[PDB]
Design a protein around this motif. Structure first.
Motif, short mmCIF file in Angstrom:
data_model
loop_
_atom_site.label_atom_id
_atom_site.label_comp_id
_atom_site.label_asym_id
_atom_site.label_seq_id
_atom_site.Cartn_x
_atom_site.Cartn_y
_atom_site.Cartn_z
N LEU A 56 8.21 -3.47 -6.23
CA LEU A 56 9.53 -3.17 -5.63
C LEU A 56 9.60 -1.71 -5.22
N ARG A 57 8.91 -0.82 -5.91
CA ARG A 57 9.00 0.62 -5.57
C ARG A 57 8.45 0.85 -4.17
N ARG A 58 7.37 0.18 -3.81
CA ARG A 58 6.81 0.33 -2.46
C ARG A 58 7.79 -0.24 -1.43
N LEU A 59 8.38 -1.37 -1.66
CA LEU A 59 9.18 -1.99 -0.65
C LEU A 59 10.59 -1.55 -0.72
N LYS B 1 17.08 -12.55 -1.36
CA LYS B 1 17.31 -11.53 -0.35
C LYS B 1 17.01 -10.14 -0.87
N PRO B 2 15.74 -9.85 -1.05
CA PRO B 2 15.32 -8.49 -1.30
C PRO B 2 15.04 -7.71 0.00
N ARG B 3 15.98 -6.93 0.50
CA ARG B 3 15.72 -6.14 1.67
C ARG B 3 14.70 -5.07 1.40
N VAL B 4 13.93 -4.74 2.41
CA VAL B 4 13.13 -3.56 2.38
C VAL B 4 14.01 -2.35 2.56
N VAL B 5 13.75 -1.29 1.82
CA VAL B 5 14.34 -0.02 2.11
C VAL B 5 13.28 0.96 2.50
N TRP B 6 13.46 1.62 3.63
CA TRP B 6 12.44 2.48 4.22
C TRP B 6 12.57 3.88 3.62
N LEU B 10 7.39 5.25 2.48
CA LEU B 10 6.99 4.07 3.24
C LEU B 10 7.19 4.31 4.74
N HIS B 11 8.30 4.95 5.11
CA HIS B 11 8.44 5.38 6.49
C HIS B 11 7.27 6.27 6.91
N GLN B 12 6.87 7.20 6.04
CA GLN B 12 5.77 8.11 6.38
C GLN B 12 4.48 7.33 6.63
N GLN B 13 4.21 6.30 5.82
CA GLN B 13 3.04 5.48 6.08
C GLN B 13 3.16 4.77 7.42
N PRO B 38 1.54 -4.48 0.00
CA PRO B 38 1.79 -5.82 -0.47
C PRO B 38 3.25 -6.23 -0.31
N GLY B 39 3.47 -7.40 0.28
CA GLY B 39 4.82 -7.94 0.45
C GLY B 39 5.46 -7.59 1.77
N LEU B 40 4.98 -6.55 2.45
CA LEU B 40 5.59 -6.16 3.72
C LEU B 40 5.26 -7.20 4.79
N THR B 41 6.24 -7.56 5.61
CA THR B 41 6.02 -8.60 6.61
C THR B 41 6.07 -8.02 8.02
N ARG B 42 5.57 -8.83 8.96
CA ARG B 42 5.69 -8.53 10.38
C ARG B 42 7.13 -8.26 10.78
#
Lengths: 62, 59, 63, 60, 59, 62
Positions: A56-59, B1-6, B10-13, B38-42
């Motif tokens: 979760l920390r990465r996402l 519903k786990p939103r991604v937070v940038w 992660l934005h830097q990557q 891991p877990g990041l989607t299109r």
DNA sequence: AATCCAGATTAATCTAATCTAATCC
DNA sequence: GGATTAGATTAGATTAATCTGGATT
DNA sequence: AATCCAGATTAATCTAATCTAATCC
DNA sequence: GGATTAGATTAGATTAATCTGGATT
């Protein structure tokens, strides 16, 4: 004394219990109080919780 | 519903990945492969790519 | 895509390291501290150590 | 001393299993449980799957 | 029954086979024999040959 | 620029009639377009819409 | 308040299970 | 082509290091 | 010399994969 | 801002029109 298998079911139950408490506050003892899954140990949960927190920390956040 | 937070990290990557491909030419599949998160989607990358292109066009 | 090659010399340094620690107490990080070999990761050593342990376990030279 | 022979039948069974999981994320343990074929070990499937990935990746 | 994806490698083999033959002797069947790629079909290269001809026409 | 096409109720209805008149063998983009006869509408507008339509029906049919 | 400390948790690291590439036949 | 061996990956276990609530000073 | 005809070639056209914009939270 | 849906774009696949080499007339 076999290795826990974190199936989607069991992981779902863990997730539900963590959300009840807050991923920030959840600790293994209070996660297991909620899960009500016998044979599951505090170390079992601790190891899964750390893996969960890394993910979760990465996402986002956490 | 786990939103991604940038987050900053992660934005830097994402910035490094997009800048390697080129802002206008970067596609989600390639951005996703470069990021290896891991877990990041299109759809995560694509939605953030769209807002990033708006933000870059205002400059 | 680089894969490690456990040459005879590399594997011998590893064995020298593991015997210096005791095959019982040996773990990848301490093994790498002794080996002093850049490019080797702890995963490289842990994979090799597990194969080494499998071999020794059948012959009984490890718990 | 018995080698597995990948008959047309059996290969098709394997391809069906693999298509049901996805070529990129298929692993021998899941392939075997879908195929439900006594006689086949993880290594039999993993060898076949290596050769299968070689062939498919050259084509994309 | 997998779609073919034309990678840098597979396309490189195509261009070398086209160039060796000379367009045109460069037709699909003989390009195919030169490339000697297991599972590559005549139609795979015929379709790619078409887009390549268009691509060359635009310089 | 060209404007993005917006599949209104009226424009979608004309596409549906064309598809149904031709059947699935003949319901390819160029023929759907000829029947619809709407100025400025292109093949790719129809092909794009046809692909979503086919997904939408496969869902209905199961 | 200020400290002690056993127990709890958590980060760091290990290791078994399993995979996949390299090599063999 | 299929088997075997060697090395990589993943998930879960174990260890080491922090933390903290409650008792004590 | 001319025709036939399978087995190709090739342009036209389709369609699945993937994309980006529009819109919704 | 991030997710989801609708419409656009692209690469590869399929179809349809045409062509040709070796056999035959």
């Amino acid at each position: 004394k076999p290795r826990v298998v974190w199936s989607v079911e069991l992981h779902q139950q863990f997730v539900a219990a963590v959300n009840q408490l807050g991923v920030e506050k959840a600790v293994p003892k209070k996660i297991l109080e909620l899960m009500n899954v016998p044979g599951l140990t505090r170390e079992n949960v601790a190891s899964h919780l750390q893996k969960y927190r890394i993910y979760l920390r990465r996402l986002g956040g956490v």
